[PDB]
């Protein structure tokens, strides 16, 4: 099977680390931090890595049953699978598929349905992925809610992510840290089966990020979220399963209205994109532009300096 | 590759109207986003309105209903119809064009 | 001619095309008692988007724009912008902005806002009553019942993220929402325009095959059933391939890859819906790795094996 | 197409243990979901546990940590290890197997009774 990338425009695609649409392409230096996200990781031949799964909406969601200490408001959720089957911690994954891959405070809504009569209830909830009790790999996640008695035990409970927050008293945009992986098994533990870190190795090349703005719910949070591959590219590579005939694939971003080639980039086999540029810069693209696979080139291929 | 010049500013009374123009030349076939910016005193350069080749427009909240962006189908010129002008509209107005993902050209 | 095909993604791996929630099961049942005319998840086999259908799975039932309100009121009116924050164009030949909810009910979510100057953010519980006389997304106006009366600022980017549906527990249970009742897109008195056509099984002994999810419930006893005619990934696939249809019906076969056996076959009609040979209501119990496979182009008078 | 037969129920003390077994015969290769159901006095039939061919399990909340479903790789028999039995677990237990989207087979049903006796 010949290799190819989706023809969807940037704005028609979904961020692979949060259920929000893509907004723009962004490139910049990435030597000051470790670029090791666990969501949105997929090789060009369709091998999912890290905690990456295929559902764009099941990212940063949690399912299970909730218990809590009487009078307290932090509820402990015993995690179930995305399809309400039992959680299996023996799988060779860093955490349940779709677990958040950044340290920060995700705010959303905890909903619950009583099975015997179909009564429902929903409350504001925030999960602190940097807290000591954030251990999804062990099957346990803590939620800070605004109710202390309303959630019933032994009932299906779901967390829907909405946005991020930060303490307004601290320095602005110090939270969240999109490039800091959480401790998936607890405070003292070490992560396992991680997708490898990513860095541009070619001289003069920088990573090309697919950037979205996470909604903010309180404070002055750093709402930038960069992913290495759009979720639709992950779904596409998994289905095509086209083998890689090289280590980098040359893509061209083209405007279908004029035929203009707007820039050139490398799609590496491990699943990330690099461009020939130095410095931080947003990319202003026409609304119809999209990536097109040209050919498998060698790794010493020098891209046109652009984008 | 693309150079532009604006024309249409000056003094007017509050509640009046001005029409700003911007002339383009040289491979305007590459232009795909045409915009207007303004530089108020003491503040940074902020956006006023944009328009794509397909005609997709965006105006900023402060000028909604008062300002209107328009462009010729050949992209040799685009305009800014400013109606009901308020004291907050005072500043230098630059017309803008985007030729590439990084490339762009401003007005004088 | 580009060969036609359907994605190999399992049902659990695919998204509902009428709400940003994953698919759970396949369902079939009689559809004569109501009108099946959803506006989201509408797409032909050759990639023609219909109704209010767009391509983003997470931007279904989301609203963007700026909010204003009567001073002191908790109800906020949002002037809709485009999904990319551009000006909303009310003149396009669509029933409403792309992704607008296609059912009458109370959708509860979170209304978030960011102040551009300093990056300050805020978020509040909000509910949109798509059946209310004030619901007019086609005109660019949508109202949100919130829990605050002074927190949201004017002329700032505001976004509604849907979460689930609610219902008045004091009334008949599961009376809301109504998934097969289209909202009034321009107001209670206006008429909907450019709607995608209604859908009904035409072959005798055949029933629609629904891709079913359960919307999260936020309060009361809501009817959380949500059936879509096509998975959102199929809408994305047909739109990209744009393969021409060689006939009016594409014959699909559901295969269990653990064994290779065909579990049932169905008709994928060119206009973009699925029918099966069955009578009565029934949930389908499928293997977790099952998938649909295009096999051949047939005509409309083909007789399916009685399964599904 | 597929025939099932339960065994291993009966009387047991509170806090005792039992192991139910379902014997499958016929086209066992076509089974892709095996499970256990129970019908308690004055109640409808309800699910207890399920297991797929690959081994993905599901246990309802009322039996979590006490009941354990398991199956043979050939799908000729699956089991239910019931520990810490309570009088609420009393009922007729049926083994189940799904062979098609609307095709399945039911066992006959074995009686499990948790009560103090002679």
Short mmCIF file of C-alpha atoms in Angstrom, two decimals, chain C residues 256 258-259 261 263-264 278 282-288 307-308, chain D residues 27 29-33 52-54 56 75 98-102:
data_model
loop_
_atom_site.label_atom_id
_atom_site.label_comp_id
_atom_site.label_asym_id
_atom_site.label_seq_id
_atom_site.Cartn_x
_atom_site.Cartn_y
_atom_site.Cartn_z
CA UNK C 256 -15.12 -10.73 13.32
CA UNK C 258 -10.77 -13.19 15.50
CA UNK C 259 -12.49 -15.83 13.34
CA UNK C 261 -16.75 -15.18 9.82
CA UNK C 263 -21.78 -11.79 11.40
CA UNK C 264 -24.31 -9.79 9.36
CA UNK C 278 -34.83 -7.28 10.82
CA UNK C 282 -32.73 -5.09 19.32
CA UNK C 283 -29.27 -4.14 20.55
CA UNK C 284 -26.44 -5.80 18.64
CA UNK C 285 -23.83 -7.71 20.64
CA UNK C 286 -20.66 -7.42 18.54
CA UNK C 287 -17.08 -8.57 19.20
CA UNK C 288 -14.82 -5.72 20.36
CA UNK C 307 -29.54 -10.75 10.80
CA UNK C 308 -28.41 -7.46 12.33
CA UNK D 27 -19.85 -24.67 17.52
CA UNK D 29 -15.39 -21.71 18.04
CA UNK D 30 -18.10 -19.13 17.23
CA UNK D 31 -18.45 -17.85 20.82
CA UNK D 32 -16.93 -14.43 21.44
CA UNK D 33 -18.58 -13.48 24.74
CA UNK D 52 -14.40 -12.06 25.94
CA UNK D 53 -12.32 -14.45 23.86
CA UNK D 54 -9.29 -12.19 24.36
CA UNK D 56 -11.47 -8.77 28.78
CA UNK D 75 -14.08 -21.82 24.90
CA UNK D 98 -23.02 -14.94 22.56
CA UNK D 99 -22.51 -16.44 19.09
CA UNK D 100 -24.07 -13.76 16.87
CA UNK D 101 -25.27 -10.18 16.94
CA UNK D 102 -28.73 -11.43 18.00
#
